[PDB]
């Protein structure tokens, strides 16, 4: 059993919910919450502006650290930092930009690194402002995470259509 209320099952793995991921995280205090990363660890807006907001620019202040110790990620790669006051543990997925003409083939990569934890609070890889179409995501997301995936969907007419049109 874990905290998680109120998410429609879609499989054995995948549950989802419509949620700003930002009051989600601070109800439950996951053992990791998901941000939608770019490779700089940027968190200007969109998922992970919302996130750093919440922590008070402590997430820029130690992602500016680590890319200054090792670099930028890759597009589909990850990095484990602090959940600072939102989570235990942070886990910043890269997924490719639509809007910078990245592979979406990386899509599938991107969601891999979510089997390295048994439970995550996620949004949908590579939606909103990164541009693919969330219905694809979470196809991707289905067809592709094996551990235990919570969903937030911050658009109520897109979660709607999401449970609509989920095979
Ligand atoms: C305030 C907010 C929340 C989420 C999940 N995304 C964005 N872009 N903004």
Same mark, same amino acid.
Do not use: M, T, W, Y
């Given at each position: 059993v874990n905290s998680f209320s109120g998410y429609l099952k879609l499989t054995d793995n995948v549950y989802i919910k419509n949620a700003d991921i930002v009051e989600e995280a601070k109800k439950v205090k996951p053992t990791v919450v998901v941000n939608a990363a770019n490779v700089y660890l940027? *968190?200007?807006?969109?998922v992970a502006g919302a996130l750093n907001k919440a922590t008070n620019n402590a997430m820029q202040v130690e992602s500016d650290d680590y890319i200054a110790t090792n670099g930028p990620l890759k597009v589909g790669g990850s990095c484990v930092l602090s959940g600072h006051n939102?989570?235990? *543990?942070?886990?910043?997925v890269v997924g490719p930009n639509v809007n910078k003409g990245?592979?979406?083939?990386l899509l599938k990569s991107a969601y891999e690194?979510?089997?390295? *934890?048994?439970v995550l609070l996620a949004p949908?890889?590579?939606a909103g402002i990164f541009g693919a179409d969330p219905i694809h995501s979470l196809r991707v997301c289905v067809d592709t995470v094996r551990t235990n995936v919570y969903l937030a969907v911050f658009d109520k007419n897109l979660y709607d259509k999401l449970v609509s049109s989920f095979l």
């Open positions: 940027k *968190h200007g807006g969109g939102l989570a235990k *543990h942070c886990l910043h990245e592979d979406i083939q690194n979510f089997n390295q *934890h048994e949908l890889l590579s």
